[PDB]
Design a protein around this ligand. Structure first.
Ligand SMILES: COc1ccc2cc(-c3nn(C(C)C)c4ncnc(N)c34)ccc2c1
Length: 453
């Protein structure tokens, strides 16, 4: 069976672990799905074919309200296609920051759901390993919506990217035993423990100025409840967190046993709002998302440089008599050529080409100046990535000051794991009045200089 025979791409939902996720539609039934597309070239397999197939077959038969539903699996020469249920409520933390109040009852209800899904998967000998807030989606945009955990089982079969754009936020949540190589299902309880700690204080239990500092803290495994925010918190919640963040996994509480914990039992059946926590979470989330957006912007810019020159070279070769004129069918064949080395098949490329032509007001039916088409086709993704970066900038700038401070930049570039000396150097080239702050344009300029421009 061939993936594109059955499904058509509607739009890109976003980038997740191991690949891009595309909102697709069944060509016959009209069923909408979220399809994780894994590039074989970019992502190595840890397991063999037989093991992956069998795992997938198991996953298709599994069903739990807090676990992403998997429907289908396809494989071609270059890609794996993982077809799951699409959820519309977004990421948990993005919903949480929008609330005016948040309590231990809300936290407990969230964690019960996570523990329930984890418990179910563990019974079936499937481990997540890379559990973190962005793997917790909300089923719908309804305020009470169920949490759906994504990416269970994948890290067993695929090697994680070593690129920082893919690694953002991973360090806070990873279990110490995962770092050292001997791990089991208990690693998921640790990660859930870290998440709970963040839910109740707004701060990561294991924090640091960069990835390695964070990992160093995790590996030591020591944390405290000495922040001001922890005075508002019950003893039972801290007791649960202690049991989940127990270093030796055999001594660590299981997911199932955690569901029976006093805290869970008590708070999921009066409590104040954790206002300090909500504020800290807002700041945490904004920082994480800006760092991510920063790396993606730089990556998209590099990709644009690559693709612009490749596309130009493809069309030059095609342009036999060298007058710079190509027809739409040729533009499609060359765009396909670029894709050959989102655009899952020929019809997707036809549409994209048509969208570019309709932007540049070039007639679809005559011969076209390809150099102009190239510019617009690329420029489009350029304008686009810039818009998502800007939005993340505005979001982070909660006071609408229009600026980010040098201290804030340190925090952002730290999470993005950009070398301290390097960004300071680029900051010095842009900030030339010792202002100690940058507006959006300036920030963008820094990122361009941080990706060889
Ligand atoms: C193991 O097989 C699968 C199959 C589909 C998957 C889809 C998503 C997914 N990501 N996103 C955006 C946050 C980028 C989603 N948005 C809505 N629904 C989704 N289902 C996803 C994640 C993991 C998946 C794993």
């Amino acid at each position: 069976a061939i993936f594109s025979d059955r499904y058509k791409g509607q739009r890109v939902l976003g980038k997740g672990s191991f690949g891009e996720v595309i909102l697709c539609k069944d060509k016959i039934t009209g069923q909408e799905c979220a399809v994780k597309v894994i590039s074989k070239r970019q992502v190595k397999q840890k397991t063999d074919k037989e093991s992956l197939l069998r795992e997938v077959q198991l996953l298709k038969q599994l069903d739990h309200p807090n676990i992403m539903k998997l429907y289908e699996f396809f494989e071609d020469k270059g890609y794996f296609y993982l077809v799951g249920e699409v959820y519309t409520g977004g990421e948990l933390f993005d919903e949480i920051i929008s609330r005016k109040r948040f309590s231990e009852v809300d936290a407990a209800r969230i964690i019960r759901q996570v523990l329930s899904g984890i418990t179910y998967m563990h019974k079936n000998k499937i481990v997540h390993r890379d559990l973190k807030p962005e793997n917790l989606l909300l089923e719908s945009k309804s305020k009470d919506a169920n949490i759906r955990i994504i990416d269970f089982g994948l890290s067993t079969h695929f090697e994680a990217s070593k690129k920082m754009k893919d690694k953002i936020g991973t360090a806070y949540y990873i279990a110490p035993e995962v770092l050292h190589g001997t791990y089991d299902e208990k690693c998921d309880v640790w990660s859930t423990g870290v998440i709970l700690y963040i839910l109740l204080s707004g701060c990561p239990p294991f924090n640091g100025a960069n990835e390695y500092d964070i990992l160093k803290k995790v590996e030591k495994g020591k944390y405290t409840f000495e922040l001001p925010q922890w005075k508002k918190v019950s003893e039972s919640a801290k007791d649960l967190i202690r049991k989940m963040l127990t270093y030796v996994p055999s001594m660590r509480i299981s997911a199932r046993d955690a569901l029976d914990h006093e805290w869970i039992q008590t708070y999921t059946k009066d409590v104040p709002s954790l206002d300090n926590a909500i504020l800290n979470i807002r700041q945490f989330q904004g920082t994480q998302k800006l760092a991510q957006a920063a790396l993606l912007y730089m990556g998209s810019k590099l990709t644009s440089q690559d693709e612009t020159k490749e596309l130009t070279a493809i069309f030059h070769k095609m342009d036999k008599n060298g007058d710079g004129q190509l027809d739409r069918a040729e533009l499609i064949e060359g765009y396909k050529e670029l894709m050959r080395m989102s655009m899952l098949d020929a019809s997707a490329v036809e549409h994209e080409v048509d969208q570019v032509l309709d932007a540049v007001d070039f007639d679809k039916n005559g011969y076209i100046e390809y150099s102009e088409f190239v510019t617009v086709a690329m420029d489009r993704k350029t304008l686009l990535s810039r818009e998502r970066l800007e939005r993340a900038f505005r979001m982070f700038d909660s006071d609408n000051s229009g600026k980010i401070s040098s201290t804030e930049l340190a925090t952002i570039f730290g999470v993005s794991d950009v070398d301290s000396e390097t960004w300071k150097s680029v900051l010095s080239e842009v900030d030339k009045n010792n202002d100690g702050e940058v507006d959006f344009d300036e920030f963008q300029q820094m990122l361009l200089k941080l990706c060889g421009n």
